[PDB]
Amino acid sequence: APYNGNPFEGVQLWANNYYRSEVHTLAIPQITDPALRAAASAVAEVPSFQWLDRNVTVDTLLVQTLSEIREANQAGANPQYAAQIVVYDLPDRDCAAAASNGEWAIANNGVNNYKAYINRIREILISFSDVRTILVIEPDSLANMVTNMNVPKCSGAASTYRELTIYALKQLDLPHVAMYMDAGHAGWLGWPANIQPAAELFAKIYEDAGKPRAVRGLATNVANYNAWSVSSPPPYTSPNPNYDEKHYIEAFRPLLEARGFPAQFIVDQGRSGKQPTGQKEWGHWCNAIGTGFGMRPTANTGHQYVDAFVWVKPGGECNGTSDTTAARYDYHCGLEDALKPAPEAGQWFNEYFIQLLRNANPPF
């Protein structure tokens, strides 16, 4: 079915069984404290995005979640539940990263692999047209074209990132779908020197895709820890005037809008509850200490440019291993402000989950 306006309005957000199963089968059994177990049980019901970060998730997790939502909706959910999904499998993924877990390479049929990926997701979404579906498109992709074109892998991947983003925006432009392209965070693209070129890039992509109706705007702070709005700039933000997501979005949207893209925003707050964080530098993204679960997902943001506060990166799922000998070890995960020992990216990290619980704001 079609919708008008903010896709988060008039629906409830589904909390998926993948995350719920991590909490119940992996987290809770390691927790003996009654209060923390009850808090954990509660966090399992908070509706976070489900990531299609590996091809195998398409015909498993995506189908499962949409099937489960349809079942719940047909069983009388009111209002109806909506899905929240991340598309995250570009070839030569994370081009500026020290290490990537992306499975596909441009040199190894990655373009065709990705197009097939998008085409299968399209088929599944059509099959589940009765479940409104909100997508985040490719974290850590086009933000690299703004600042990291000096990196050979990024320069070599740029035309592919662009073409394939346009491909996804057109192929997933379906009436029951909404899309938000990733747009980094205040401490990446919000810096004054970066913000106009970022607006130029995103608005051009939007134009080049034919301004598809399903595209609502942009997603910010995905997998990061920034504040939505705080009175004093965290120390590691200096000297950025855009020291929180509200400042970034208020500066960014007029630039985008003048360029033909009046983007609405969704802002990750899943690990933003504690401010300031334990990050020693803004760019320390990996398993940062001193962070907490943040404000609960809601369409009622109170801000004219923000369609929803969301939990995109699910807290407790590791950002990367701290084992320096591991094949895909990223040195950011070995820093003094990265919690250790940490398992491989995407694996449950229980000590990190407990940290997020203890620092939760609002508390569980």
Ligand X SMILES: CO[C@@H]1O[C@H](CO)[C@@H](O[C@@H]2O[C@H](CO)[C@@H](S[C@@H]3O[C@H](CO)[C@@H](O[C@@H]4O[C@H](CO)[C@@H](O)[C@H](O)[C@H]4O)[C@H](O)[C@H]3O)[C@H](O)[C@H]2O)[C@H](O)[C@H]1O
Ligand Y SMILES: *[C@@H]1O[C@H](CO)[C@@H](O)[C@H](O)[C@H]1NC(C)=O
Question: Rule CB under 6 A: which residues touch ligand Y?
Answer: 55, 58-59, 113, 120
**53 near ligand X (CB under 6 A):** no
Residue closer to ligand Y, measured from CB, 59 or 207 = 59
Stretch that binds ligand X, among 19-27, 83-91, 140-148, 207-215 (CB under 6 A): 140-148
Stretch that binds ligand X, among 103-111, 161-169, 186-194, 245-253 (CB under 6 A): 186-194
Residue closer to ligand X, measured from CB, 151 or 230 = 151
Planar angle of CA 350, 269, 278, nearest 5 degrees: 60
Nearest to 331 by CA among 341, 322, 340: 322
Over the window 143 to 172, marking each residue x when it contacts ligand X by CB under 6 A and - when it does not, the resulting string is ----xx------------------------
Q: How far is CA 129 from CA 2, 82, 121, 132, in A?
A: 9, 11, 12, 7
* Biggest CA-to-CA distance, the chain: 55
Take residue 27 and report the two structure tokens written for it.
């987290």
**223 near ligand X (CB under 6 A):** yes
Among residues 50, 165, 194, 291, the one that binds ligand X under rule CB under 6 A: 194
Angle, in degrees to the nearest 10, between helices 350-358 and 34-43: 100
Instruction: Tell the smallest beta-carbon distance from residue 238 to ligand X (Å).
Output: 8
**283 near ligand X (CB under 6 A):** yes
- Rounded-to-integer distance, Cα 220 and Cα 54, Å: 22
Nearest to 154 by CA among 199, 93, 201: 93
Among residues 58, 97, 137, 199, the one that binds ligand X under rule CB under 6 A: 97
* CB atoms inside a 10 Å sphere around CB 33: 10
Instruction: Tell the smallest beta-carbon distance from residue 336 to ligand X (Å).
Output: 16
**282 near ligand X (CB under 6 A):** yes
Take residue 286 and report the two structure tokens written for it.
């990996």
Instruction: Tell the smallest beta-carbon distance from residue 67 to ligand Y (Å).
Output: 15
> From ligand X, ligand Y, none, which one binds at residue 130 (CB under 5 to 8 Å depending on kind)?
none
CA dihedral angle for residue 183, residue 189, residue 194, residue 198, rounded to 10 degrees? 10
Nearest to 49 by CA among 271, 229, 239: 271
Among residues 42, 72, 96, 124, the one that binds ligand X under rule CB under 6 A: 96
**305 near ligand X (CB under 6 A):** no
> From ligand Y, ligand X, none, which one binds at residue 361 (CB under 5 to 8 Å depending on kind)?
none
